[PDB]
Design a binder for this molecule. Structure first.
Ligand SMILES: [Co+2]
Ligand SMILES: [Co+2]
Ligand SMILES: [Co+2]
Ligand SMILES: [Co+2]
Ligand SMILES: [Co+2]
Ligand SMILES: [Co+2]
Ligand SMILES: [Co+2]
Ligand SMILES: [Co+2]
Lengths: 387, 387, 387, 387
C-alpha cells in the first residue's frame, strides 16, 4: 500500500484542515480546530510538518499575554510530535483594513501597518524553524481600472519586498521569500497573477536571490494555464522555493480540492516532473475539505492528498523505468531535443548548407512525431493497465 | 471627426487585411491581395506603415530570382507612398516542417533550419528599416505531457535567442527583438504563454537589453488576464517594445477582432495607459477582417481599428483632464499610492508606534475607498455622457 | 440628463445594497442595513421596488412574534414610500443544513424542510404583492462525481417544483416561478447551469406554463456564453419572466458588479434587445457594491446601475432610429432573415431548380455580408461619436 | 487485455482519421485518405462502423456520374467488411457560401440551398442504413451583435428542422435527428450553444419526438460545463440519441483529442453513466489525430480511443460492484436521494410538524455527507490501486 511517513515531506497549513466551511454564500459547517489538536492528528497521519498564517495561530488583536499563551500551546504539540514548521506566512487579507490590499493599499498608513504585521511574524517563523516565508497578495489588485495605477502599485510592491529583504539580511536570518501568484479572487484582478509575472517581478528586486515562487496548482489553472509547464519554467530559473498542491476543476472560483482531484493527468505530469527534477522542498497541501464534510471527512480528505501523491509517484516512476517508454521517447526524439542546436557555433551554422540551402523541408516534414503512442503508454501507466 | 494620419503611428501587418478567411472548418472566402496593393490602400487610409512575415512577402520556396522580384515590387510601393516598415517577423508555423515547433522542435535539423530562415529575414527587415523583429512561437509547445520536456525546450529556446542576439551584434544592426506571448492555439499549450512568462525568460538571456515583449490584446485575454495590468508591468520593466492591438470576446479561440471590439472597457483602459505612459512605438493592428466580409468590408474593418483608437484616445484624455475626476482620484487616495511607504527607512518604520502599536485598524478600515464613484465618472466619460 | 423614476421599473434586492462585504477570504466591511432604511433610500434614488429572500427580512429561527415585528416595520416603509415588491425568493443556501442543497439534498428530511420554508415565504410574497417567485438552487449540485446521481436529483427537482405548482394552484395565487441558472459557485457544478438547461427542464414539469427563467447577466458569462443571445432564446420561448442585471469581467468567481460594468458591449446589446422586444417586467439589479466601499459608495453604485441602463437605452434607441443604420441593416440582409425560407412549401422547394440544380454557390459566396460597417455604426452610437 | 470488437459499438467519422491536419495557422501535414481504405483499416482495428458528412464521401460539386462512382467504391468496402453506417451528417460549414450559416444565413437563397443539400444526403444516409442524422450548425451564429437577430434566426432554425421533419415523415423514413451543440468556433458565438439550449429548442419543434441531441465531450467543456451532468439531463429527458467522444483540455479552441485525454476523471464519470444508464447507441469518436502525427500515429490514436473507453468501462464496473463502495454510497445517502420527498402528498407535507415546526436544522446540519471518502474510493478504482 501507500502509507505516508515524515520522510515524504507532506505538510499542511493550519487553515486547511482547520477551514470551518464559511463560503461567500453560507455559514460555517464545522467548529473550530485547536492548532495543537491539528498538529497531533496530522502527525498521526504521517505528515512531516505544518504551516500557518499569523492569524491562524494568534487571534487578531490578542494581547502580548494571550499571544504568548497561544504560541506556548502550539510549541508544546510540535515538541511532543516532532512535527516541523517549514513555512509560515502573514494574513494580509481577512481584516477589513486590508480591503484594498496590504503592501499596495492606496492608504499609506495601512501599507506601513502591513509591513509591521509581516515583520512581527517573520520573527516568530524563524524562531519556529521556518525556512521559507510565503507572501500571497490576495488583496493586491482591483475591480476597476482607475482605482489602482499598476505601475505605481508595482513600485510600492517592490518597496515592501525590498524592505523585507533588508530586514532579513540585517537580522542575519536564514529564511527566503516565496511569492504565491493568483489571477483573481478576492480582487477582480490580482497583481502578479501567474508564475511568470511573479518571476519577472523578482528580477527587479534589490536582492533577487532571496525570492522565489510558491505556485499553487489551482491558481495557475484559474487562468487556464499548464501547471507542469509553469513549474518547469520556475525550476529552469531555479526559483521553485516551495509549492502548494491541490486540485481545481477548471476556470472558476478557487476550489482548493484535495490533491489528485481536479485535473488528474496534470497531477500525474506534475508529480513526474517534481520527482524527476529532484525537488527537495515540502509537498505542501493548500486545500480545503469541502463544507459538506464533518471532521471524519476532514481527515479522510487530508489522508487522500498524500495517498494520491504516493500512487501518482509510483506510476510516474514505473512510466519512466519502462523500456517500452524509453523506446517511445527515442522514437519521438526527446533525445535530440537535449542536443544543442548549434554546438558548432553561429559562424559554422551560417556556412552550413545542410541547414538551409540544401535542406529538404518536405522530407523532414514527412517524419511523424510519434507523440500519440507515447501519450497512450503514459495513460496505460497512469491507469495501471501496465506498470 | 477622427481622421488618422501617419503621425498617429497606426501600422498593419500584410497578413491582417490580406487574410483570405481560411479557418479550421472552412475555405478561403476572399482572393489574395498583392502586397503592393495593400500598401497603397493602407496609405490612403492614413496608416503609418506595414509589417510582414517573410512568407507573406516572398512565397515559401521561391528562387533567389523570384524573391528579388517580389521584394522589388514591394519596395516600389513603399517608396511611392512613403510608408514605413517598423517591424518584421518570421513565419515559423505554417509549413508542415514546423509541426512540432521551430526553435524547440524535437528534431535538431528543423531547429537549425528555423534559425537560418529567421536570420535571412532579419537581413531583409533591417534593409527595409525595421526597428523591431517579432518572434511569435506559435508552434513551440505540446498537446501531451511527455512529448516535450519543458526545461530542455527552454534551454533550446534560450540557445536560439542567444544565437540571434550574437548575430545582430556581430552585424552591428540596430534592431531589437520582441517576444509575442500566446497561451494556446495552435498547440495545446504554448511555451512563454503570457507577458509575465516572456518577461521572466528574457532576464535569463545573455544580452537581456536586446529583448522585450510584443503583447497582443486578444492573447492575454485568452488566459482571462487583465491586458492593461500586464501592459503596466511590461512598461514598469521597460520592455514594451511593440504592441498588437485587436479585440477578443473572452476565453475561446483567438478571434483577432478589430480593435475596439471585444472588451471595450479594457480598450479604454489600455489607451488611457499607453497615452499617459507616453508609449512612442507603433500602434500595430494584428486583427483579421471576419470571413463574412468582402474587400469593402476588409477596408472598413481596418479603418474601424484606427477610428476606435482615436475616439478612445479622446475620451481617455477628457477623463484625465476633468477636475471632477482629479477630485475623485484624490478621494480614492491615488495620490497617497505614489508616496513611498517608508521614505523614512526601515529603522524608523520599526520604531514607529503609529505604524503598529498605536495603529487603529478599525478606524482605518472604516474609510471608504470611493472607487465606485470614480469608476462611474470613467464610464460617463467613455460613453460621452460627459466629456 | 438620465434621472430614474418608478416608471423605469428599476428594482433592487435587499441583499444587494445590504451586502456587508464578507467574502470567502475576508470579514464584513460594512455594518448591517435595516430593511426599512434601504426601502426609503432606494425610493429617494428613484427605484420602483424591492425584492427579498425570506432570511433578509426575518432572521433565521426568529419566533412568530419577532417575525411579525420584522414584517410590520418593512410594510410600514413600503406603505410610506409607495415602493412595490414585484419578486421574492427563498434563501436555501446560507444555513449549514443546506450544505448539500435544499430540493435535491441527499437527506430526505432536509428536502422536506426546504419545501416548507419555501411555501411559508410564498404566502408572504403573495401578501406583499409579488408576481414572480424566484428560485436559485445555489446548493443543488456537487464537487465530486458519485456524491450526486444527477438523473435522480432531477427527479427530486421536478418533484419539488411540481409540489410548488400544486400549492400555488390550490391556493389560487396569481404568482409565477422563475428559475435562476448559475453554472458553479458555491457548488463545484450546479444543476441547471444555464438558461438553456433551465428552459429544457421546465418543459418536463406538470404545469410548464407556471415557470420561466430569471437569468442573470454575470451567471451566463461565467460559462463564457453570450447573454443577449440567451435572453433572445428565452424571449423566443416566451419564458423571460424576470431578469437580473449586473456586470461580470469574464470567467471567474461571481463578481456581481454594478450593471454597465464588466462586458459593456453586451450590456448595450442586452438593453437593445429588452427595449426592442418590449420586455415589460422589472429591471432588477442583483449586484454587490464592492467591499472597498462605505455607505456613500453603496448608494453611488446603486445609482450607477440605473444611470447606465438609461444611457444605454438612449444609445440603443438612437442606433435603431438612425437612417444610416437602417440602410446598413438592409445591406447585411437582416430583412431577408425575416422572410420564411420556404413559404412556398416542401414540395415546391424540392421542385425548385434554382434552390439546388441551377444554384451557383460561388456567385452567392461572393456577396459580402457587410457586418463590419454595421458593427462600427453600433460602436459609434454606443460611444456617442454619432447620435 | 482490452481488445475492441464490433459488439462494443465503436464508430468513427471519415473526417476523424482522415483529417489532413490543416489548422488556422498551418498547412496539411498528411495526405488524403481514401474513404474505402479508412473503412478497411477501421474494421481491422475492431470498429463497428463509420459515419460521414456528404462532402467527405463525395467531392463538393461532383457530377451525378462522379458521385455514383464515389458511392460505389464506399459501398464496396462496407460490403466486404460488414461495417455499418449508423449516422451521417451534412457539411454546411466548409464552402464559402455558408460563411454566415446554412439554415440561418441572412440570404434566403443560401438557406434554401442548405435545405436541399441536406435532403439529398438524408436519402443517401437512409439507403446506407443510418438511424441518426446529425446536424452541427457550426456556421449558425455571429461575431457582432446586429449581424444576427437571434429571435428571428431561431424562427428560421425551427422552420428548417420542421421542414426536415416533414420530409422524413412524408418519405416514411425511420431516421431521427440529433442536434450537436457547440458554444463557439468557427463563429464568435454559435446558436444553441449547449446541450440545454438544444434540448429546450427541440420542445418547440412541430414533432419533438423526432429530434434529440448528439453532445460532444469537448464542446460542453468549451463552456466549462460538466459533461456527465449534461449527459444525465439529456438521458433524463430521453434525448440522448447519439454521442461524440473525445478529449478537451479546458476552455480554449476545440481540440478534439482522442477519448481519455483531456479531463480524465470526467471521461470515467461519463463511462460510468453511459454504462449504468444502459445507453445502447454508438460510441462515436469525433476526434482528430494531432497534426504532429503520420499515418501510424493516426491509427495508434484511433486505437487509443477504444482502449481508453474499455479500461474506463472496467474500472467503473469494478467501482460500482465493490461492497465497500456500496457501503460508502449508503453513508452518503445516495439511497435516500431516490426516495420521493413527499410521497405522502402536499397536504400531508403541510401538516407535518417534523418537516418544519419541530425540525432541528442544527442537528441535521451536523451530519457529515461523507463525500470525500466516497470520492477517494472512486479515485482508487480509477487508478487501479484497488479493483
Ligand atoms: Co487556493
Ligand atoms: Co496556496
Ligand atoms: Co491573435
Ligand atoms: Co499578434
Ligand atoms: Co451573481
Ligand atoms: Co441573480
Ligand atoms: Co469538436
Ligand atoms: Co462532434
Amino acid at each position: 500500500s501507500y502509507q505516508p511517513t515524515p520522510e515524504d515531506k507532506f505538510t499542511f497549513g493550519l487553515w486547511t484542515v482547520g477551514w470551518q466551511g464559511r463560503d461567500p454564500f453560507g455559514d460555517a459547517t464545522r467548529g473550530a480546530l485547536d492548532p495543537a489538536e491539528s498538529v497531533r492528528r496530522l502527525a498521526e497521519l504521517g505528515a512531516h510538518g505544518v504551516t500557518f498564517h499569523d492569524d491562524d495561530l494568534i487571534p487578531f488583536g490578542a494581547t502580548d499575554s494571550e499571544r504568548a499563551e497561544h504560541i506556548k500551546r502550539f510549541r508544546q504539540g510540535l515538541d511532543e510530535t516532532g512535527m516541523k514548521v517549514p513555512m509560515a506566512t502573514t494574513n494580509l487579507f481577512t481584516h477589513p483594513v486590508f480591503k484594498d490590499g496590504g503592501f499596495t493599499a492606496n492608504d499609506r498608513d495601512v501599507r506601513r501597518y502591513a509591513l509591521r504585521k509581516t515583520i512581527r511574524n517573520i520573527d516568530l517563523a524563524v524562531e519556529l524553524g521556518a525556512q521559507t516565508y510565503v507572501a500571497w497578495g490576495g488583496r493586491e489588485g482591483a475591480e476597476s481600472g482607475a482605482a489602482k495605477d499598476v505601475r505605481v502599485a508595482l513600485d510600492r510592491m517592490k518597496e515592501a519586498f525590498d524592505l523585507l529583504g533588508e530586514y532579513v539580511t540585517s537580522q542575519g536570518y536564514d529564511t527566503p521569500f516565496a511569492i504565491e501568484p493568483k489571477p483573481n479572487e478576492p480582487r477582480g484582478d490580482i497583481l502578479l497573477p501567474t508564475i511568470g509575472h511573479a518571476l519577472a517581478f523578482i528580477d527587479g528586486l534589490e536582492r533577487p536571490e532571496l525570492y522565489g515562487v510558491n505556485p499553487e496548482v489551482g491558481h495557475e489553472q484559474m487562468a487556464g494555464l499548464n501547471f507542469p509547464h509553469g513549474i518547469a519554467q520556475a525550476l529552469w530559473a531555479g526559483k521553485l522555493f516551495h509549492i502548494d498542491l491541490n486540485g481545481q476543476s477548471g476556470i472558476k472560483y478557487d476550489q482548493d480540492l484535495r490533491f489528485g482531484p481536479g485535473d488528474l493527468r496534470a497531477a500525474f505530469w506534475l508529480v513526474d516532473l517534481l520527482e524527476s527534477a529532484g525537488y527537495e522542498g515540502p509537498r505542501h497541501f493548500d486545500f480545503k475539505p469541502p463544507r459538506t464534510e464533518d471532521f471524519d471527512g476532514v481527515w479522510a480528505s487530508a489522508a487522500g492528498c498524500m495517498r494520491n501523491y504516493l500512487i501518482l509517484k509510483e506510476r510516474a516512476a514505473a512510466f519512466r523505468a519502462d523500456p517500452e517508454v524509453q523506446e517511445a521517447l527515442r522514437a519521438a526524439r526527446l533525445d535530440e531535443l537535449a542536443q544543442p542546436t548549434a554546438g558548432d557555433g553561429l559562424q559554422a551554422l551560417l556556412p552550413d548548407r545542410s541547414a538551409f540551402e540544401d535542406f529538404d523541408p518536405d522530407a523532414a516534414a514527412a517524419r511523424g512525431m510519434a507523440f500519440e503512442r507515447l501519450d497512450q503508454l503514459a495513460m496505460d501507466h497512469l491507469l495501471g493497465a501496465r506498470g
